């Protein structure tokens, strides 16, 4: 702040020096009319005043020795720590993809590792159901794969069980019966298991397999 | 308030703008008695130490210096203004007046972001900058 | 409007104000009473004393300072009294406004929380400090009547007390799982991790990888550790 | 009996824990003077220095830091970007990048609803493309490729505290083992 | 909601989709801006 | 807060539980009934440990009791402020709920006593179901009929006959004389329901209510918790009052018998037809409404959405409104259509958020804004908002 101390002006106008850019009797009657008007028409300092009057007896040496400053609350240290802690963050590991977790495999996967250490010392309900058009993509691919081989029952069983896990009900039970039209026993072992639900029809499928 | 220096003539203003090349020049035009002028004086008084590198803040009174009143069209109790290389800077705040500043900013960080963004856009010669915060509910 | 326009052609309480006005009144008076030769060099330090006194009032720290002139210490005290009264009164005043649904705008919503949490924590501290003096309020004759009721209830119910978890236990694994995942599930919706949350994930992960070791550690914490971190 | 003495409780509460350890020693040494002083003539002037050190050092423990000068934001000026990619440093930034599977959550397939799974709080967490078009139909999710580099790991302070706690828990389980 | 608005088509007349030049909307996907906001916060940046 | 019952299913089994017991509805000879709703007041805050370590050594081996007792001291820090916790409970601890529940199990036993609590729970060999008994004799043996405690709040139902009731109220009036008939000054009606469906103020029923609350007030010492008439609601069903009024969780239920339907009635959406297990007819209607608490929590929540966001995306605002609105429609299902001010606040709040989007696009605001912008799914590019 060198220029703040100096204080010469010269005869220059301020606007021109920088190359700046911009982006009486009636008055006496109005003054007398306002005088016609004004003629007819704090607490804080009152509170602290009796004290500022009581500052009068403080000698100059006591004014000169005032302990300069002090940090009581340790605000600086705590600010540096709270800043150090919040700097960076991170990216969460891929294991937190929520759909994978099931409890059984984790428990039998765990208690065996526990017991091993002790011996050494000595689908989710949460996911949305499949969308008709995705499942339709599945139907087209699997349809191409069953149309690939009329024989090779592996396809028929596959299009049966995958659509079973996906949908089942009528679709699978119709497909299996469709492609079951003879030598391979597997379409029968599957068709029996899924489509039966009642004794007579169980026997009807069994006898055909026989 | 005591933290920030005051400019007692128009030539302290002008030279304060001219002698400083590398950092923004921020002037509050207003009077000590006003209610809105002391608030931005406190806000800017806390920010001055953080920002001393890329900006500097000064104080100017309208009654002390009335010379700039007509040239920049100073109304309202306070106007903050931003200067870089003698060039009046400009930023569209949404207030509809891209010039100067009027309202009292709330948070320190929002004003430091204004200073930072005006500075960064000022280094590129860019006349208009766009604030990250459109406050126009205020004006 | 016309007259103003033509002349310009020929010419051209509340929480926000009251605090700053208190600072300005007090600083005005103190600076007025100072000798003007040393005046300006101390002034910034006096401002720092006001800030520190307020920060100490916000901490309940008593703010007792080494040698100081008595009248100034009186002044800063009375200032803390008034600014405190206004700070608390306005803090409670804005809260009910937020309850009603009136518009306090924004930063007031965020600050009002910090102010009311300072107040709440002060009420808690005074609660417990007055619970030092008077001691427990139960008294033995009332504790008797309370304890017989549980004794008779549990004896009438023929209730066997819960034992301490054994070193060899069947469901330990099945209790760890249910425990750990219930600490784990907080972080499953997060793509990014703050520094602490990442540490806690390391804790849960090692708790899975070393179940025997964490069972031993938990059990020893149960039998042993009586002192805990804040 | 010491914690009730004059030289401790005449000071603020926060200083007490440090004064015990500080006073206890100075008591012991005093006793170790008293054993050596001959019975006929017993003399002070060590305990005068030893009160001086304790009282003064206590004022100092209560004195609190001086104020600090405000630290400044460095400068907004952008700096030219520098690049290196090693085996070491890619291993470093593996923490700091979105992995492949994590990137596939960020892809919204145009025209049809996401896979969303209920979060523990019940708010649907979308994983958009992370599962192959066939895997939504079957609901088998995926294993895909798990990045083992962004796995959470301990800070230096926490890692020794865990191991220490476990090692002492070990001697505890042994003490209960033989007894 | 999709049928209330008239179907996908009556919706796409309200958008720039036909400007994107795509013949059919089948094989298309969005890049989420949520995750887009994450990849930018792994760089060191000022609050502004 | 049992594992088997979702709190709306709780309100359901509570109303059906009130009906299924015998002959509370008949007023023919002198009979009446009373419900209390009393928050235990300061409860976890007034928990005292010298009593806890003992009550826990009853229920648990001492090593766990000592851990649980010393784990609550700790030290508590918020920025500058620090205090050791001597007195209250810290409920941020995982096991705190257990303590809290166990602690409530004490107070439940001062109100009910050993004799009546054994009648409610039953023998350890064949303990009862939630609301049941063995014989009607055990039901009618004691005035207290149905009792529950949900966290802090207590629900107590009483059945009185003039023989029994006159005694109790004569005792309270006797030991608290009120010549100016001021019992009705502070009595707290439910402001949600109109005239005909509120509690009528009549010296008999009010004196019963204050007498009941004066008995149960006396039953609990003041060191454990604090029970105050201000936090309590008392309903009376008698000759004079057809309406049985209570509020559980966020729901407010009134109950009428088919017997008393003659007093003016208008059907709602929240009407519950209630069936006795024997007559298998519909003996009561329970009308539902949403409380003035959780309506104002919803006000304050959408306010929080439009406030706490200075700068956020539009789809985050849409998703916060989708979450909070899905929660409110999901928990309150039947009771919403019966609440006028909650429908009004829905209509205001939705257009209000739409206004926050409009003011986010441009400052001029539009004349009309096509709804396909807001309401298309996120995958088609809209906000997906409901």
From Swiss-Prot, chain A:
Subcellular location: Nucleus
Domain of life: Eukaryota
HAT repeats: 133-165, 167-197
Function of the protein: Participates in pre-mRNA splicing. Part of the U4/U5/U6 tri-snRNP complex, one of the building blocks of the spliceosome.
Assembly and oligomerization: Component of the U4/U6-U5 tri-snRNP complex composed of the U4, U6 and U5 snRNAs and at least PRP3, PRP4, PRP6, PRP8, PRP18, PRP31, PRP38, SNU13, SNU23, SNU66, SNU114, SPP381, SMB1, SMD1, SMD2, SMD3, SMX2, SMX3, LSM2, LSM3, LSM4, LSM5, LSM6, LSM7, LSM8, BRR2 and DIB1.
Any further remark recorded for this protein: Present with 2250 molecules/cell in log phase SD medium.
Entry protein name: Pre-mRNA-splicing factor 6
Encoding gene (name): PRP6
From Swiss-Prot, chain B:
One GO CC term on file: nucleus
Source organism superkingdom: Eukaryota
Subcellular location: Nucleus
Swiss-Prot/TrEMBL keywords: Acetylation, mRNA processing, mRNA splicing, Nucleus
Pfam family, one: DIM1
Gene Ontology terms describing biological process: mRNA splicing, via spliceosome
InterPro entries: Dim1, Thioredoxin-like_sf
Principal subcellular localization: nucleus
General function of this protein: Essential role in pre-mRNA splicing. Also essential for entry into mitosis (G2/M progression) as well as for chromosome segregation during mitosis.
Oligomeric and partner information: Component of the U4/U6-U5 tri-snRNP complex composed of the U4, U6 and U5 snRNAs and at least PRP3, PRP4, PRP6, PRP8, PRP18, PRP31, PRP38, SNU13, SNU23, SNU66, SNU114, SPP381, SMB1, SMD1, SMD2, SMD3, SMX2, SMX3, LSM2, LSM3, LSM4, LSM5, LSM6, LSM7, LSM8, BRR2 and DIB1.
Family label: Belongs to the DIM1 family.
Name used for this protein in its record: Spliceosomal protein DIB1
Native source organism of the sequence: Saccharomyces cerevisiae (strain ATCC 204508 / S288c)
From Swiss-Prot, chain D:
Biological process terms in GO annotation: mRNA splicing, via spliceosome; spliceosomal snRNP assembly; spliceosomal tri-snRNP complex assembly
Subcellular location(s) of the protein: Nucleus
Sequence segments annotated as region (Disordered): 61-87
Superkingdom to which the source organism belongs: Eukaryota
Keywords: Coiled coil, mRNA processing, mRNA splicing, Nucleus, Ribonucleoprotein, RNA-binding, Spliceosome
A GO MF label: RNA binding
General function of this protein: Promotes the association of the U4/U6.U5 tri-snRNP particle with pre-spliceosomes to form the mature spliceosomal complex.
Additional record remark: Present with 1260 molecules/cell in log phase SD medium.
Subunit note: Component of the U4/U6-U5 tri-snRNP complex composed of the U4, U6 and U5 snRNAs and at least PRP3, PRP4, PRP6, PRP8, PRP18, PRP31, PRP38, SNU13, SNU23, SNU66, SNU114, SPP381, SMB1, SMD1, SMD2, SMD3, SMX2, SMX3, LSM2, LSM3, LSM4, LSM5, LSM6, LSM7, LSM8, BRR2 and DIB1.
Protein name as it appears in the record: Pre-mRNA-processing factor 31
Provenance organism: Saccharomyces cerevisiae (strain ATCC 204508 / S288c)
UniProtKB/Swiss-Prot annotation, chain E:
Name of the molecule in the record: Pre-mRNA-splicing factor 8
Annotated compartments: Nucleus
Coiled coil (UniProt feature): none
Quaternary structure annotation from Swiss-Prot or TrEMBL: Component of the U4/U6-U5 tri-snRNP complex composed of the U4, U6 and U5 snRNAs and at least PRP3, PRP4, PRP6, PRP8, PRP18, PRP31, PRP38, SNU13, SNU23, SNU66, SNU114, SPP381, SMB1, SMD1, SMD2, SMD3, SMX2, SMX3, LSM2, LSM3, LSM4, LSM5, LSM6, LSM7, LSM8, BRR2 and DIB1.
Region (Important for branch point selection), start-end ranges: 40-48
Taxonomic lineage of the native organism: Eukaryota, Fungi, Dikarya, Ascomycota, Saccharomycotina
Transmembrane segments annotated in the record for this chain: none
Domain of life: Eukaryota
Free-text function comment from the UniProt entry: Functions as a scaffold that mediates the ordered assembly of spliceosomal proteins and snRNAs. Required for association of BRR2 with the spliceosomal U5 snRNP, and the subsequent assembly of the U4/U6-U5 tri-snRNP complex. Functions as a scaffold that positions spliceosomal U2, U5 and U6 snRNAs at splice sites on pre-mRNA substrates, so that splicing can occur. Interacts with both the 5' and the 3' splice site, as well as the branch region. Has a role in branch site-3' splice site selection. Associates with the branch site-3' splice 3'-exon region. Also has a role in cell cycle.
Note: Present with 468 molecules/cell in log phase SD medium.
Full-sequence range covered: 1546 to 1593 of 2413
């Amino acid at each position: 702040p060198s220029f703040l101390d100096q204080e010469p002006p010269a005869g220059y106008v301020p606007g021109i020096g920088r190359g700046a850019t911009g982006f009486k009797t009636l008055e006496l009657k109005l003054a007398q009319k306002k005088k016609k008007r004004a003629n007819e028409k704090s607490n804080v300092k009152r509170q602290f005043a009796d004290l500022k009057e009581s500052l009068a007896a403080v000698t100059e040496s006591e004014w000169m020795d005032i302990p300069d400053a002090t940090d009581f609350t340790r605000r600086n240290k705590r600010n540096r720590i709270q800043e150090q802690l919040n700097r960076k963050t991170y990216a969460a590991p891929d294991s937190l993809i929520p759909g994978n977790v099931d409890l059984n495999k984790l428990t039998e996967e765990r208690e065996k590792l526990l017991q091993s250490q002790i011996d050494e010392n000595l689908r989710v309900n949460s996911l949305s159901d499949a969308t008709l058009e995705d499942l339709q993509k599945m139907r087209t691919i699997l349809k191409s794969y069953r149309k690939a081989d009329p024989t090779n029952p592996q396809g028929w069983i596959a299009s049966a069980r995958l659509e079973e896990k996906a949908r089942k009900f009528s679709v699978a039970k119709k497909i299996i019966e469709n492609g079951c039209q003879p030598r391979s026993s597997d379409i029968w072992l599957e068709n029996i298991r899924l489509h039966e639900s009642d004794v007579h029809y169980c026997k009807t499928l069994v006898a055909t397999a026989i | 308030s005591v933290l920030l220096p005051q400019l007692r003539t128009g030539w302290h203003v002008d030279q304060a703008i001219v002698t400083e090349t590398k950092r923004l020049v921020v002037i509050r035009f207003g009077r000590k008695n006003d209610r809105q002028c002391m608030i931005m004086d406190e806000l800017l008084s806390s920010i001055a130490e953080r920002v001393r590198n890329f900006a500097v803040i000064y104080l100017c009174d309208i009654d002390e210096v009335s010379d700039f009143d007509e040239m920049y069209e100073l109304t309202d109790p306070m106007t903050v203004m931003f200067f870089y290389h003698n060039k009046h800077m400009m930023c569209d705040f949404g207030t509809g007046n891209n010039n100067k500043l009027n309202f009292i900013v709330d948070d320190k960080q929002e004003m430091i972001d204004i200073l930072e963004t005006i500075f960064r856009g000022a280094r590129k010669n860019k006349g208009l900058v766009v604030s990250p915060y459109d406050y126009n509910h205020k004006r | 409007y016309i007259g103003n326009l033509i002349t310009r052609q020929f010419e051209g309480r509340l929480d926000a104000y009251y605090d700053l006005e208190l600072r300005n009144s007090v600083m005005d008076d103190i600076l007025e009473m100072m000798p003007e030769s040393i005046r300006q060099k101390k002034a910034r330090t006096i401002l720092q004393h006001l800030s520190e006194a307020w920060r100490c009032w916000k901490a309940n720290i008593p703010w007792d300072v080494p040698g100081m002139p008595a009248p100034i210490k009186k002044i800063i005290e009375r200032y803390i009294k008034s600014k405190a009264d206004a700070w608390v009164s306005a803090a409670h005043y804005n809260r009910e406004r937020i309850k009603r649904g009136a518009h306090v705008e924004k930063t007031m919503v965020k600050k009002n929380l910090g102010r009311l949490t300072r107040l709440w924590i002060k009420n808690e501290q005074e609660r417990q400090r007055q619970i030092q003096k008077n001691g427990p309020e139960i008294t033995p004759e009332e504790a008797t009547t309370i304890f017989s009721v549980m004794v008779e209830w549990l004896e009438s119910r023929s209730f066997s007390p819960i034992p301490f978890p054994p070193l060899t236990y069947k469901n330990d694994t099945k209790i760890l799982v249910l425990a750990l995942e219930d600490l784990k599930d907080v972080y499953a919706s997060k793509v990014r991790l703050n520094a602490s949350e990442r540490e806690e994930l390391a804790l849960i992960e090692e708790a899975y990888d070393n179940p025997h070791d964490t069972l031993n550690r938990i059990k020893k914490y149960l039998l042993t550790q009586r002192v805990f971190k804040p | 009996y010491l914690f009730a003495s004059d030289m401790i409780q005449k000071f603020p509460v926060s200083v007490h824990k440090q004064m015990l350890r500080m006073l206890c020693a100075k008591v012991s040494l005093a006793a170790r003077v008293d054993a050596g002083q001959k019975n006929g003539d017993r003399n002070t002037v060590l305990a005068h220095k030893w009160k001086a050190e304790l009282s003064k050092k206590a004022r100092k423990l209560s004195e609190a830091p001086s104020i600090s000068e405000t630290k400044a934001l460095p400068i907004p000026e952008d700096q030219p970007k520098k690049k290196r990619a090693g085996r070491k440093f890619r291993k470093y930034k593996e923490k700091f990048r979105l992995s492949h599977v994590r990137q596939l959550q960020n892809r919204m397939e145009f025209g049809k609803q996401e896979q969303t799974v209920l979060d523990s709080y019940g708010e649907e967490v979308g994983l958009g493309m992370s599962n192959t078009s066939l895997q939504q139909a079957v609901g088998a999710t995926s294993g895909s490729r798990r990045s083992a580099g962004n796995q959470a790991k301990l800070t230096k302070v926490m890692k020794h505290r865990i191991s220490e706690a476990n090692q002492q828990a070990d001697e505890f389980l042994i003490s209960l083992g033989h007894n | 909601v999709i049928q209330a608005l008239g179907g996908i088509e009556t919706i796409l007349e309200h958008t720039l989709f036909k400007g994107t030049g795509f013949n059919s909307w089948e094989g298309l996907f969005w890049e989420k801006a949520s995750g887009f906001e994450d990849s930018m916060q792994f760089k060191k940046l000022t609050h502004a | 807060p049992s594992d088997s019952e979702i709190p709306p299913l709780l309100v359901y089994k509570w109303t059906q539980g009130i009906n299924n017991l015998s002959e509370i509805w008949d007023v023919s000879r002198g009979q009446s009934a009373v419900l209390l709703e009393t928050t235990l007041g300061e409860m976890a805050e007034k928990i005292d440990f010298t009593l806890l370590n003992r009550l826990l050594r009853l229920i648990v081996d001492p090593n766990i009791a000592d851990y649980i007792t010393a784990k609550n001291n700790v030290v508590i820090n918020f920025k500058d402020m620090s205090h050791v916790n001597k007195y209250g409970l810290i409920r941020g601890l995982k096991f705190a709920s257990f303590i809290f529940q166990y602690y409530g199990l004490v107070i439940d036993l001062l109100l009910l006593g050993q004799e009546r609590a054994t009648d409610l729970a039953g023998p350890a060999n064949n303990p009862n179901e939630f609301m049941q008994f063995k014989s009607k004799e055990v039901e009618k043996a004691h005035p207290i009929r149905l009792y529950t405690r949900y966290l802090d709040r207590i629900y107590m139902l009483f059945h009185f006959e003039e023989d029994e009731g006159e005694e109790l109220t004569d005792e309270y009036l006797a030991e608290n004389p009120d010549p100016n008939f001021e019992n009705s000054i502070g009595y707290n009606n439910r402001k949600c329901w109109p005239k005909d469906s509120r509690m009528r103020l009549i010296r008999q029923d009010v004196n019963l209510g204050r007498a009941v609350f004066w008995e149960i007030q006396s039953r609990v010492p003041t060191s454990l918790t604090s029970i105050k008439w201000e936090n309590a609601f008392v309903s009376v069903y008698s000759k004079n009052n057809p309406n049985l009024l209570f509020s559980m969780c966020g729901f407010e239920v009134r109950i009428l018998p088919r017997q008393r339907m003659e007093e003016v009635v208008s059907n709602d959406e929240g009407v519950w037809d209630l069936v006795d297990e024997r007559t298998k007819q519909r003996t009561a209607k329970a009308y539902l409404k949403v409380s003035e608490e959780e309506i104002k929590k919803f006000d304050s929540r959408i306010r929080g959405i439009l406030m706490a966001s200075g700068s956020t995306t539009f789809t985050k605002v849409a998703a916060k409104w989708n979450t909070s609105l899905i929660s409110l429609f999901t928990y309150f299902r039947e009771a919403i259509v019966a609440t006028e001010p909650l429908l009004d606040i829905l209509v205001k709040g939705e257009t209000r958020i739409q206004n926050r989007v409009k003011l986010g696009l441009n400052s001029k605001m539009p004349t009309r804004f096509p709804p396909a912008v807001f309401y298309t799914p996120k995958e088609l590019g809209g906000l997906g908002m409901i």
